[PDB]
Design a protein around this ligand. Structure first.
Ligand code: NA
Ligand code: NA
Ligand code: NA
Ligand code: NA
Ligand code: NA
Ligand code: NA
Length: 418
């Protein structure tokens, strides 16, 4: 361990598994997120790199290198800000026609997706700025999933643009109140949970008797190719479902998780499916919502078929309540004691809720190469419920994916009752 570090502490089980999965693959594209954001505003490359330096100084994960094999346990090395370079390459797309610009944006994505990371050289997030016209640039943001979850990514982008807008307006960059906890505290919470016997036993008992029938239509083997599908969500679903939620005393997440289960049981013609429920284990401490890092753990979730979809919602709520205190027991540890466990699908509920510089939307992005066959996102975006999924097109025929999307639409309709 070199001198000078701010800190060092173990990698999490998800950090380790993802990096081991990347190392086993040889492909830089695996678990490699890449997104282009539209930014309204003058592009000043030096001010943008200054803004990034400010963020780098505020967040340990952006000064962190991973050391998988060097010591006896995989370690996170937190380097001092003085040792971490803040680079934002500027590219010039000004003056191009529309289709050329779109193609050049796509090319930046694909090139970055094919560019590997040096796990010992922070930051493990890369930025670029692509000038589009005098009032508009694209901000490229790219990281391995081992570094940031989606909530952290959103917080990162929002804080970069706030700091940048401060510098562009000539004021001092403002900072939020220091959180109580840091990422190191989450690490400790997970290691305790991994060692917690009642939590290990809870997950063993919960899966006793479960069966793992493959997703029907999903080939055992195939190449790695990713595709995405939007579900045709009924007209006013969010408003109608929030009202069902308040009246019935069931949260919205529970209603949607029951819908997920109904879709999957119908599509698979199965009495029960075992899906992965993506939960976050951020410490329950002030400011934990402002931390940057990877806080996700995927939990086994058993969803049984029922004609009474509201009773399925109640059971999904009871599942979340019973599993809550056990939610930081890592999936890999559950798998170590249950080798039969296999999750072909994931459920992800996403709920991340001015003049001058403003974020204008997403111009382009990758469908991230992952190994999980089917990942379903339920997203509260604005006043809209957005549902979609990504799947292994190399293993899952597109005709089945469109059938599955119909099942999700049918499930949402069954919730509303039209
Ligand atoms: Na997320
Ligand atoms: Na994002
Ligand atoms: Na559909
Ligand atoms: Na179906
Ligand atoms: Na893509
Ligand atoms: Na809606």
């Amino acid at each position: 361990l070199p001198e000078g570090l701010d800190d060092a502490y173990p990698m999490t089980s998800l950090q380790q598994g993802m990096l081991l999965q990347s190392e086993a693959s040889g492909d830089p594209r695996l678990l490699h997120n890449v997104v282009l954001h539209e930014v309204h505003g003058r592009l000043d490359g030096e001010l943008l790199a200054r803004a990034w330096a400010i963020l780098i100084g505020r967040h340990a994960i952006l000064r962190t290198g991973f050391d998988l094999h060097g010591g006896q346990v995989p370690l996170q090395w937190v380097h001092p800000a003085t040792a971490v370079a803040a680079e934002v390459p500027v590219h010039d797309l000004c003056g191009l026609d529309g289709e050329t610009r779109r193609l050049r944006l796509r090319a930046w994505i694909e090139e970055e997706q094919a560019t590997p990371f040096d796990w010992s050289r922070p930051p493990l997030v890369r930025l670029a700025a692509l000038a589009l016209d005098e009032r508009r640039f694209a901000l490229g943001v790219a990281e391995h999933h081992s570094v940031l979850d989606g909530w952290s990514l959103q917080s990162l982008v929002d804080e970069l643009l706030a700091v940048y807008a401060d510098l562009l307006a000539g004021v001092v960059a403002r900072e939020a109140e220091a959180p109580a906890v840091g990422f190191r505290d989450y690490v400790a919470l997970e290691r305790e949970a991994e060692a917690n016997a009642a939590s290990a036993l809870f997950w063993l008992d919960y899966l006793a008797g479960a069966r793992y029938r493959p997703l029907p239509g999903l080939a055992e083997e195939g190449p790695r190719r990713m595709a995405a599908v939007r579900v045709d969500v009924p007209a006013d679903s969010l408003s109608r479902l929030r009202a069902l939620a308040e009246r019935s005393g069931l949260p919205l997440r529970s209603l949607l998780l029951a819908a997920h289960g109904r879709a999957l049981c119908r599509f698979s013609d199965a009495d029960e499916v075992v899906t992965g429920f993506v939960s976050h284990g951020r410490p329950e401490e002030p400011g934990a919502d402002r931390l940057l890092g990877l806080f996700l753990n995927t939990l086994p979730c058993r969803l049984s078929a029922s004609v009474d979809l509201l009773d399925s919602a109640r059971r999904a709520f009871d599942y979340e309540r019973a599993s809550l205190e056990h939610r930081r027991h890592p999936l890999a540890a559950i798998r170590r004691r249950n080798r039969e466990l296999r999750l072909d699908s994931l459920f992800n509920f996403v709920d991340f809720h001015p003049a001058g510089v403003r974020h204008g939307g997403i111009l382009d992005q990758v469908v991230v190469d992952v190994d999980v066959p089917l990942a379903v996102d339920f997203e509260v975006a604005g006043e809209r419920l957005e549902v979609g999924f990504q799947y292994a097109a190399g293993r899952f025929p597109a005709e089945r994916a469109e059938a599955l999307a119909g099942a999700y639409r049918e499930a949402l309709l069954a919730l509303l009752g039209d």
